[PDB]
Design a protein around this ligand. Structure first.
Ligand SMILES: C[C@H](N)c1nc(C(=O)N2CCC[C@H]2C(=O)N[C@@H](Cc2c[nH]c3ccccc23)C(=O)O)co1
Ligand SMILES: C[C@H](N)c1nc(C(=O)N2CCC[C@H]2C(=O)N[C@@H](Cc2c[nH]c3ccccc23)C(=O)O)co1
Ligand SMILES: [Zn+2]
Ligand SMILES: [Zn+2]
Lengths: 106, 106
């Protein structure tokens, strides 16, 4: 499935913070589930797999120091929800940061 | 001379837009002198040498598509005047952009 770059959430039932927060249950993984819900993610129930209610993008293997919003932007730049909560400034900063990181190592 | 990263302009007499704009005279160079004055620069009177009234930083060899604020940030990141007119968001964007550029080529 391709990313929903529409202004309409792909998964309306997970549009409310609360709704998302509930899908987690006892969260044992490194990243805070509150942060995840705010960043728009709800849990799938297998490993640390989360999915954005709006663009539908998914992430896993959440490392210690890895940020929800940061990753959200990194992998689902077209997500409108992301755009609504952070604005393009933030988003570009993150994309420049990531690309520069990949370059520094290269 | 080192860059003035103080909140007090190094050259108070050039603190007013008008004051700066006047130092140019007939400007023949590529970059717009209005843009330059806004970015805080006043002309020295030799080639396209300009200097920030606040941090005192200087630039020359103004190329066709080269921006005052962009360059100001590139070479005088510590300038408080710069910080006051653009905010850190903008400034980081520019620094990430420049560094990533230097990396892409490398
Ligand atoms: C933040 C973390 N380090 C991180 N995760 C990811 C990440 O999952 N990505 C990057 C874009 C693609 C995705 C990924 O590989 N998923 C795999 C496996 C998978 C199948 N169903 C789901 C549902 C939810 C998450 C993953 C997943 C795929 O084939 O779709 C990048 O950084
Ligand atoms: C925007 C343009 N491409 C550009 N200019 C510059 C630029 O001048 N720099 C970068 C930081 C240092 C400065 C520079 O080299 N000046 C020379 C020559 C010089 C002597 N007196 C003055 C007064 C005003 C400007 C230059 C200058 C130096 O030794 O101080 C970078 O990009
Ligand atoms: Zn999303
Ligand atoms: Zn300055």
């Amino acid at each position: 499935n391709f990313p929903n770059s529409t202004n309409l959430p792909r998964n309306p039932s997970m549009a409310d913070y609360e709704a998302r927060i509930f899908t987690f249950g006892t969260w044992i993984y490194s990243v805070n589930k509150e942060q995840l819900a705010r960043a728009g993610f709800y849990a799938l129930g297998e490993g640390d797999k989360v999915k954005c209610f709006h663009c539908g993008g998914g992430l896993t293997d959440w490392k210690p120091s890895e940020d929800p919003w940061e990753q959200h932007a990194k992998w689902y730049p077209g997500c409108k929800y992301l755009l609504e909560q952070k604005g393009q400034e933030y988003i570009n900063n993150i994309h420049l940061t990531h690309s520069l990181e990949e370059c520094l190592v290269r």
